[PDB]
Ligand binder design. Structure first.
Ligand SMILES: Oc1nc(O)nc(O)n1
Ligand SMILES: Oc1nc(O)nc(O)n1
Ligand SMILES: Oc1nc(O)nc(O)n1
Ligand SMILES: Oc1nc(O)nc(O)n1
Ligand SMILES: [Cl-]
Ligand SMILES: [Cl-]
Ligand SMILES: [Cl-]
Ligand SMILES: [Cl-]
Ligand SMILES: [Cl-]
Ligand SMILES: [Cl-]
Ligand SMILES: [Cl-]
Ligand SMILES: [Cl-]
Ligand SMILES: [Cl-]
Ligand SMILES: [Cl-]
Ligand SMILES: [Cl-]
Ligand SMILES: [Cl-]
Ligand code: NA
Ligand code: NA
Ligand code: NA
Ligand code: NA
Lengths: 367, 367, 367, 367
């Protein structure tokens, strides 16, 4: 059964800092054993050789193990997703999701935040980017969606995932058994792994019909409107975030789409959808501390243009467009929220329309 | 005497493309010999080894020479400033400034756009970053300010400059005569050259008292509110842009300040100051094609924070913060204008407050 | 008929410098109209957005047009290959190949340098990286090989090429006609274009049997021992360099293979093969100004190891391994020649064994 | 009293791998509590935001604490220097230094390896790069030199150090007390901290007279021939490595200088100086497993040339010359040793002549 959720966004003061999580536990805001998911941004390069993700992961799991009754083995099964790369003003942070004990919940028929978690069946190197990944992910998303107590896909607003990369060893693992892989460049496998996962989410939620192998990274009109996929277990980790009626709690999630890197109105639409009443032309000062965080994807479009204007992102061998567009949308987004602590993630194949991406917002509607 | 000004922003379709300038001349929008200044963004890395600036410079001067009566020598004296680096959505473009023949001008008492140009006395390597650069720049700014027909410094809204770097040869040139230089790193000399130039502008316009050598790059509370300095002649090139009454024309300039990288309200204040009436909470769709361009500076603050949130820009050895903050503010700015063709420049020592910078806007008020 | 060849390596003093070529012509070392090929290194980033290649190309073709009777159209057909990226000590330079007038040649039965040039049939975006590119290249290599007066493939020591990339427009050009492309990442298309071209050279010279599409970038045991391919016309440009008996001249070419990035003995083997007698353990001081240049390829092996030791090149999202291994092998090679002006090129799929590449040497055997 | 030393170079299989150290302890090669120093290369970017250094540091200290009787506090005082950045073929590794118990030592009058350690007095931000750092370092080097049982500075072959950087907090710490700092760019403070430390070593060992503040980073003819300084405690950590007679052991150290990035003969001179007899023109195959490691510094010269040839390292805003020259000299060095596991460090102000650096070699002379 779905439980009421407490959500807290905390800053990371350094690469290995989990002190703010420790403080939340100490002050009784949440119990260590009730942390069911963490979604954060780390200050690494955001690519393959980003070791800030494991540094934060160790620091956070050490807190959870030290202050709870869970074993390191049980703590190790908590989904924690670290999206590296905080280019520009983006501030390293972690959004903590925890269940609320029944004696602190006020049950209500209003839609309130609920979280579902699942793990897919083993992802083979040869599956990555193909229909095998799509079917296995789609099944796991259906699992997590049911685990959240959500029956209507329209009540799912945000599916944050984690999927593996193709490495030198897994690439051999395929060739040992005879098989081919989609790509042998590990950096490109990042975009591929997120894309194939996104297609699985879109299928599970009924946003698209089952695609074919030749659609992956090619048919960019096929996408999920709630998928936020990251890489890079030998299995897709799934975190479904939506709303359920009759659970209680003070937070609510909504979403929309950023049609391109400058679509601030899409971000405001997400915040409105989450339940915050805002003016017709809102401004960051209207939020009054009620926006916990936003979670969105961005990408450089394959046509090399934004609103009719050419940019040179796709030809830049000096600074990969991953970093360029992340910094850009980081500013666009933080300008809306007024808080540089925003979850902005790059590599958005099949996640929102080309050149854009989904955007979810969590707001505090409680007293 | 100040003349009425025609202003046109055109895209660059490639690194060597000046076809849009050629088209403006062919269609009679402006005469080649009346082009007095060009200010543009090029798609290079924006650092020391950025050769897109010279490629655009050659392409543009070839057009001016081919379609005018001016010799290549006279064309060579036209101030053309190319700010490299178009990280993110920023679109390569050039803003062309031209005088209008008297038989096409409607004289008016309303403030309208006027441009003044000057060259300072020779800048010695040992001057760069010291009071020598400040005094020589301040004198040239007073020259250009008078050349624009501007007597009140409050009527100066935008001073775009070009100053040299410290190179292996000029560094010897100093040591040959005995002298020391401020830095021997050419990449750092970029920030220094712009900073010392900015202090000169601030002195000339009476924004600050004459500083000392130890203030340069250190006393960041001393700044000009209209300086936009770029590098990197052995002389400061100065382009003063302001308004004059009784000249006529259809364009007007205004300015404000971006207090930090997310200060969109500062950009809107510049547009309002330029003469466009806008709603209380404006949006890009209110502009109705009346905003020609904005010109602004950005920088990562030395305290490493934006609105109380830590970022890791100053410690990033992978992608210099020059590129990170440029992409970020590029998005913030283009979100306001709705046009990725924006003049966003990085390296803003003594140009606006720390972590921010000046922002000027040119609007079309004509029929 | 093959003509005797004069070969001169000159430095570039700046990005746009062709003064050393101009000096060679002025001093009567060579005639402008007799320049048949130029192969050089430019100081750009060596990737997609490297504009130092076109800057050098324009500067060099302007010299050839200005000092010869050839029209700009005829000069435009001279194969000039600029390999960008001079990471580390590699010094920007150009190797100039020119025919010698008959009244300056001493015919000899000794093997002496000869150059052959050809152009393949149009390369379609959909051909790139597939058997279509391989067959079209193989035919052009047979053309250039015959144009050099070479009948035995063992007399071909160095085939320098130029092939196009997959761009946003050509990718559409395929999809407009229905077709698929190998990759849509332009940076990766560099490695693909060179690889498919290398396979064509290997087929033409009988080094391999005709491969299949699934071999390209995958069967790295299939390679040419003389191919040096660069990108990125809509056609493979081919420059075959070998030896012919009975032509005369003072230069001779030889080659071997660099088995890995540290294989200096492979470079020395190339110099020995070119005709220079050297000690058993040679050193750079044994060359006595008789080595004109070396031309070689390098790459990071897919197994991520060099001589049993792991390196992290393939996982580095900060500095692409293209640049890392180029700088590394630049030092290894310049340590052998004693001259930082070495032609070191990266991206070596099907060019020498995995982790290595071919290496050719041109020596001056004349009085 | 100096003790006999056991030296072992082990690879790192991953960023957090200390298994090879654990194996050495388990097999009885060395005792955990007798490890007195570790000097290693890690696969990070080698700049300010390199977190592979702390990852390796934690992994290695955890082994030392787990397998010894030393407390984490005592283990924390063991000097461990991690030089990040393994550009090109350089393989991540750690050289472990341990004392040998008396019942395993064969005392000999031959010069054999000895290690001395010291800590300087507190380094103030305002000291960095000035005569204060030089005097405090010089005193600590004299301490470590005596701790190694070395009386003649000619018997010191290698002084590996660790010194702090200037950070946002320490820079305030100076300005709070009134003081100025040398630079406010943290990336540049790396080169400064190593330079000032190198001058201290040179003074202590009598290689130079006491310099002045204006010499630091400027008088590059003043240098130590054994200093290898890294950054970045609030104190200079010192590791002196030399030879002593009458101690016993099987290893010996020697050194020379690399006059420029291609000076392989300098590396061979170091190996010869260490006691290995080699041919006149040695080759890597002559080493027969007797070379434990080499330790050297490299840098791009301020004149921008190597052996009369221009390179573009100092103007490269895309890939800092730190990374370019490190990869280059990594290849040059590994070509000599035949082992990519080489200690190659960049940033060499006052460490060997300009454009070069010291090079030390440790060889195994035992049965
Ligand atoms: O670590 C990471 N960061 C981002 O922004 N995207 C991915 O796929 N991974
Ligand atoms: O070329 C250039 N671009 C920018 O943004 N800033 C400077 O100083 N130069
Ligand atoms: O321009 C260029 N340089 C190199 O080294 N390799 C390729 O394919 N292109
Ligand atoms: O971490 C590090 N690596 C190197 O090569 N040089 C310094 O100063 N620090
Ligand atoms: Cl409960
Ligand atoms: Cl509702
Ligand atoms: Cl309203
Ligand atoms: Cl007139
Ligand atoms: Cl008014
Ligand atoms: Cl209103
Ligand atoms: Cl003839
Ligand atoms: Cl022969
Ligand atoms: Cl011999
Ligand atoms: Cl003992
Ligand atoms: Cl001896
Ligand atoms: Cl011998
Ligand atoms: Na998308
Ligand atoms: Na500023
Ligand atoms: Na190869
Ligand atoms: Na040095």
């Amino acid at each position: 059964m779905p439980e009421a959720i407490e959500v807290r966004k905390v800053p990371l003061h350094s690469v290995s800092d989990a002190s703010e999580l420790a403080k939340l536990i100490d002050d009784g805001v949440l119990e260590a054993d009730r942390v069911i998911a963490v979604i954060g941004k780390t200050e690494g390069n955001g690519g393959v050789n980003d070791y800030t993700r494991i540094i934060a992961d160790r620091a956070f799991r050490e807190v959870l193990s030290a202050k709870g009754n869970r074993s390191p083995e049980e703590v190790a099964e908590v989904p924690i997703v670290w999206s590296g790369g905080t280019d520009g003003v983006i501030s390293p942070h972690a959004t903590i999701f925890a269940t609320v004990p029944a004696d602190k919940v006020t049950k209500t028929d209003e839609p309130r935040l609920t979280v579902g978690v699942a793990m897919s069946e083993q992802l083979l190197p040869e599956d990555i980017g193909r229909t095998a990944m799509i079917t296995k992910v789609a099944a796991a998303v259906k699992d997590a969606m049911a685990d959240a107590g959500i029956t209507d896909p329209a009540d799912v607003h945000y599916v944050q995932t984690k999927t593996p990369l193709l490495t030198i060893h897994t690439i051999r693992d395929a060739k040992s058994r005879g098989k081919t892989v989609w790509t042998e460049q590990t950096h490109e496998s990042m975009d591929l792994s997120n894309g194939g996962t996104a297609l699985g989410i879109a299928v599970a939620l009924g946003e698209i019909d089952m695609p074919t192998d030749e659609d992956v990274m090619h048919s960019r009109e096929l996408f999920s409107s709630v998928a936020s996929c990251s890489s890079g277990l030998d299995r897709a980790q799934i975190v479904v975030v939506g709303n359920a009626r009759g659970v209680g709690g003070r937070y609510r999630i909504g979403h929309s789409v950023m049609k391109d890197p400058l679509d601030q109105d899409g971000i405001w639409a997400a915040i409105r959808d989450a339940g915050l009443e805002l003016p017709e032309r809102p401004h960051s000062s209207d939020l009054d501390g009620q926006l916990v965080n936003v979670f969105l994807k961005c990408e450089a479009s394959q046509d090399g243009t934004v609103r009719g204007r050419r940019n040179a992102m796709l030809d830049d061998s000096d600074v990969h467009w991953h970093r360029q567009i992340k910094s850009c949308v980081g500013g666009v987004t933080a300008a809306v929220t007024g808080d540089p602590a925003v979850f902005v993630s790059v590599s958005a194949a099949h996640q929102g329309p080309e050149g854009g991406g989904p955007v979810a917002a969590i707001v505090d509607l409680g007293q």
